Design a protein around this ligand. Structure first.
Ligand SMILES: CC(C)CN(C[C@@H](O)[C@H](Cc1ccccc1)NC(=O)O[C@H]1[C@H]2CO[C@H]3OC[C@@H]1[C@H]3C2)S(=O)(=O)c1ccc(B(O)O)cc1
Ligand SMILES: [Cl-]
Ligand SMILES: [Cl-]
Ligand SMILES: [Cl-]
Ligand SMILES: [Cl-]
Ligand code: NA
Lengths: 99, 99
């Protein structure tokens, strides 16, 4: 698809068999999701955004579908205000910015 | 241009007679620039992201040049860690996400 930006670029994702809404976010290096259960071990990460830092749980090699496109990669889980798909997974779905 | 997302999508902007580097950010509703002076009236605003809220000054009807393309809109000025070009200005340069 070609997504214009008059509205937020919200898509449906599927992670852990569950559908969620997330924002396609070219300003995010990494994908950050709200609290949920994922399998396996996690590693710590402190990430900084507009208002300061939050602690998140880093899960690697997680199966996630984004707007129907299959990805497998890193997901950060923590107290984000919105689910954000960052460049680590936007590159997996072949996303570019165009003007 | 087509901008891939292997790296942060940084561009040069001209705002208030100044050159700055800014991120093309589909996850931002509005454009948020680090502290600088702009002319005309403003009003206070609180904006929230990862890590909470910051206080900014909202300036309306500001001309920006974004990677050589002129646009006009609202610019929020305050203690952002990164200069962000949000959707309010990305739409005006005809920016789309494509996959
Ligand atoms: C969160 C979004 C719903 C909204 N945001 C826009 C978003 O793209 C931000 C931009 C940014 C980049 C770096 C530092 C600070 C901000 N991305 C962000 O926080 O990314 C973080 C995390 C992802 O992986 C790494 O990449 C960078 C770091 C780091 C950890 S926003 O900036 O919070 C924002 C909120 C509100 C309004 B508004 O109301 O117009 C406008 C903007
Ligand atoms: Cl990844
Ligand atoms: Cl980079
Ligand atoms: Cl605007
Ligand atoms: Cl359009
Ligand atoms: Na003004």
């Amino acid at each position: 698809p070609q997504i214009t930006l008059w509205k937020r670029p919200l898509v449906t994702i599927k992670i852990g068999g569950q559908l969620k809404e997330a924002l396609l976010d070219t300003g995010a290096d990494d994908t950050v999701i709200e609290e949920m259960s994922l399998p396996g071990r996690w590693k710590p990460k402190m990430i900084g955004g507009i208002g300061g830092f939050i602690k998140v749980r880093q899960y690697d090699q997680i199966i996630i579908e984004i707007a129907g496109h299959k990805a497998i990669g890193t997901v950060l889980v923590g107290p984000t205000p919105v689910n954000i798909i960052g460049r680590n997974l936007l590159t997996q779905i072949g996303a570019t910015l165009n003007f």
